Write a protein that binds this ligand. Structure first.
Ligand SMILES: *[C@@H]1O[C@H](CO)[C@@H](O)[C@H](O)[C@H]1NC(C)=O
Ligand SMILES: *[C@@H]1O[C@H](CO)[C@@H](O)[C@H](O)[C@H]1NC(C)=O
Lengths: 51, 103, 51, 52
């Protein structure tokens, strides 16, 4: 509901960047299940996530 | 009850018997060990279930490794062991917790 | 230990009492089995005789 | 499914050898006890080796 979530199984997450239709984001903490949000209600419609 | 070697059964109301423990004895058997385990790391995905009750609380764990099945989860409150497969898959196991907010 | 000379064996015809079969054993047609079952049976046998 | 009620009664009780060249075992003998469980559960028996 808040945003997208990246799941890593090989090792920890060092750094990654996500892309959206008209927005982008980049965040990293170093855990397995990390959450990345763009804004409040910015993704409304049909879009493709490119991480 | 449809079952081999016996067709007589019966079940009264909830009895809650005292003990039904087993007794296992070994005489001879072989088991192969790999001892070639490599780097493996997993994480938690979902969590749900009851309180400290009969069915317990089921927690889904995802792993990723090259070995078929080499894993042993150990934690306080309860210990649960399970088997995995080669590659990345999804597995669901249940543990015993004694707190509503499991954090 | 050795094959000593015998006058009764010069005729070349020996009776059936001079043939001894150590132990009573009979044979029969068999069926091939996988190696896992054979290894398990060998392990159980070597566990049943620790001396 | 899940598993509970671990025992580990006879860990490190092997007298094996090189094991066919790379890694094998011969036999494991001991004794353990499994407590009662609810109908529809699994009781796992995890062994522990000093080498593996
Ligand atoms: C984890 O997310 C929800 C939570 O219940 C669950 O329905 C879903 O099936 C789970 N994800 C996978 C990949 O099984
Ligand atoms: C792992 O599993 C696969 C498929 O079940 C099997 O072919 C292979 O022999 C297994 N390897 C080991 C070491 O058990």
């Amino acid at each position: 509901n808040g945003g997208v979530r990246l799941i890593t199984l090989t090792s920890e997450l060092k750094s990654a960047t996500v892309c959206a239709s008209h927005f982008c984001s980049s965040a990293t903490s170093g855990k397995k299940s990390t959450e990345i949000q763009f804004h409040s209600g910015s993704l409304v419609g049909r879009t493709a996530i490119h991480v | 009850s449809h079952d081999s070697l016996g067709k007589i059964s019966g079940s009264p109301l909830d009895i809650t018997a005292i003990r039904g423990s087993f007794s296992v004895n070994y005489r001879g058997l072989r088991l192969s060990l790999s001892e070639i385990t490599a780097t493996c790391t997993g994480e938690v995905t979902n969590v749900s279930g009851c309180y400290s009750c009969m069915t317990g609380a089921k927690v889904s764990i995802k792993l990723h490794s090259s070995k078929n099945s080499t894993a042993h989860v150990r934690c306080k409150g309860d210990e649960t062991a399970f088997s995995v497969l080669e590659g990345v898959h999804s597995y669901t196991v249940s543990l015993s917790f004694d707190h509503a907010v499991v954090d | 230990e050795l094959c000593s000379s015998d006058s009764g064996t010069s005729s070349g015809l020996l009776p059936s009492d001079r043939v001894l079969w150590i132990g009573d054993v009979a044979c029969q047609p068999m069926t091939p089995i996988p190696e896992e079952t054979f290894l398990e049976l060998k392990s159980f046998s070597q566990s049943e005789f620790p001396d | 499914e899940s598993c509970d009620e671990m025992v580990h009664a006879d860990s490190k009780l092997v007298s094996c050898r090189q094991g066919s060249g790379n890694m094998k075992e011969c036999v494991t003998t001991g004794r353990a006890l499994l407590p009662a469980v609810n109908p529809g559960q699994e009781a796992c028996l995890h062994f522990t080796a000093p080498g593996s």
